Subunit: 149 residues, 6 copies
């Protein structure tokens, strides 16, 4: 049993031109790219994405920072939702562990390069929000026998 998580490179990842490095970290574990799309995030979609924060004082500033180019991604793998969260590291980069994306690339939570789903429920919701069903691609990795038990 594999699962799928929603990962999104934020505008700072695009603008600092580290998209390839981010993708490589997930490919390195044999996670499969099931979907990928460059878009420019808009306030209306971001308000849905961040619905859990509705009415909170920091939400307007969060939406402003995210209004820009983003790379929407779906990666598939064993326990990938929780594992991708571990790979990203703490929301605050100063607290994140060395070897994680936020620790290795970033300084502050408001520019922390990447978003990943926090749960199976949120991954399903986020994938549906950002991707159309036909944009999720089903194929098998050739090295599957050497990646999976």
């Amino acid at each position: 049993m594999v699962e799928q998580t929603y990962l999104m490179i934020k505008p700072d990842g695009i603008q600092r031109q580290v998209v390839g490095e981010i993708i490589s970290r997930f490919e390195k574990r044999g996670y499969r790219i099931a979907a990928m799309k460059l878009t420019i995030a808009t306030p209306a979609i971001l308000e849905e994405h961040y619905a859990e924060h509705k009415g909170k004082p920091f939400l307007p500033g969060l939406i402003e920072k995210m209004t820009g180019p983003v790379l929407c991604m779906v990666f598939e793998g064993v326990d990938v939702i929780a594992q991708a969260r571990k790979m990203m590291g703490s929301t605050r980069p100063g607290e994140a562990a060395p070897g994680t994306i936020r620790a290795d690339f970033c300084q502050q939570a408001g520019r922390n390069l990447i978003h990943g789903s926090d749960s199976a429920e949120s991954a399903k919701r986020e994938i549906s929000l950002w991707f159309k069903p036909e944009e999720i691609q089903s194929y098998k990795l050739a090295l599957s026998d050497y990646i999976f038990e």
Copy 2:
């Protein structure tokens, strides 16, 4: 004065899991990602993509190799069409220069990891074939003053 080229990671680039490395090579020069999407190429679109080879005996082999997951990309930069061709290297990896993608990653022309547009006209045609206009994203790189004269 910048232009845009169509670059497509072929199924071998997906399956060998070098997508991030490929993207990083173009980001390294300050080329801007104007569009990106993962799809599974169909014979119908591939026949149009390779229309110049219609009626040639090798065309079905071109289509069969490409019938699989691909990463469609548009990169923007100065002289990017010709420069991306130089970065990919010769169609036959054995004839490509060290430091090019095909020489660094590949052995044979039928598995040469990546496609790039040949010319201004073919770039325009290929971008329109593989992307809808709403999928092309316009934004400015923050480091523009240090990339461009």
Copy 3:
């Protein structure tokens, strides 16, 4: 005072073609390659290597997965037995720390890329199993004065 440990790249490390990357991680700390040999592991030698697991339900599957090309290695360094174990990370990649081999490359314990000795006793036994004394090479690293206190 240096010691030596036995490290073995498993068939998944060979087939995913990450041998050089694995070796570089150990070279990076100034560990010295004292022995190295590519072989195809057989059930007979694998049963002796994994003798502590005879009678366990997982042994037949472990032997099957290990019956393939392997890279046998001996590395020398201060505390290298325990330190290589730390560098590999937990047997289960999902529990391994960021920056370890298993966390960076793998998903499941049954395909976890590499073996390393767990103790001085096991290192001595494993080195003797896979290498004859004449295969252990003694030389001094040129940068020794800058590696060892």
Copy 4:
């Protein structure tokens, strides 16, 4: 909005193992700004002042001897950079340092642990002044600031 500056010094082992660029890249990767950088050869006299906290301890003479050689003096600027650089360097003893840190990734023993970084705000001010003249510290703004800082 508040950044600080720390003193980081590549020790002679970092120079001789020719990993200076890799070390610098690790700090550049987080958007830390190079405010000062110079190659020098450390002398016993400056090392005794740098390591004044260890005066009288038995290990000090050997520490000075190993540090007498080429070093790269550096000042990096960023949010919480003093403590952050210590996190990135890892434990003084490489065997105790976390994977992904400089000491764990490159080193074996504390006496050859590749790099020094200030341990506090007071030590950073003292060490920056000790090793650098004021005119060697450069002020400029990173073009990527809007995407590094909140």
Copy 5:
């Protein structure tokens, strides 16, 4: 579909010289050949001695530079066999010119080295030399036959 066509493959003898061992760039060198989907068919660390080096460099017998070459090469070496399409000529192209200063950027010798006498790596110059060098440095049972799982995406 995606399955490869049959191609004849070659095997070349590549040897990391003592400078490659001592500068601790073994992994980086191996990665360059793995990156193209070349298969490791054999690999062994040894210490090269004058007698075996004299046979390795038999074409240089009696030449005045041979003694110094043997001295440089007396030390730890990594013996390797890599397999791939046209791998003998391709590996030579990847190593670059004998003189690193003449080697093309992106080759091993241009990227790592300064002078011919410390140029990090040896590779066979022809099929006949590869057969002879492999026999010199490896026993027959040390050559391993297996197939790369990514063959359908490495080979056309």
Copy 6:
């Protein structure tokens, strides 16, 4: 017989934060850092540095782009003046060979990341211009026996 060349990372190399990568390319060949200093280039020193272009119409724009942070460097090696020029590649990145700094990082001559001396006479003049004598450091690389014949 070794020589010394003057290499200078231009403001675009500082601002794109590729200083470490540049330094690593020269360290990779066993070139010795003999001197290194971060400064801010002024028009007065830049006019002397570019004295050969006195009176030419492009000189004011060149000076303007170079007025910013720069990393002054001296590297020592066999034939290092010519070799560093080869490693940088053509002044115009579009003409530069794959694997060179300018081809790998840059798009246009006006933002081409790095300067290197063009001759022994220019290297001696440029080192004297940008460094005080006491800033040149004399020491021997411990890897010398494995770098030099």
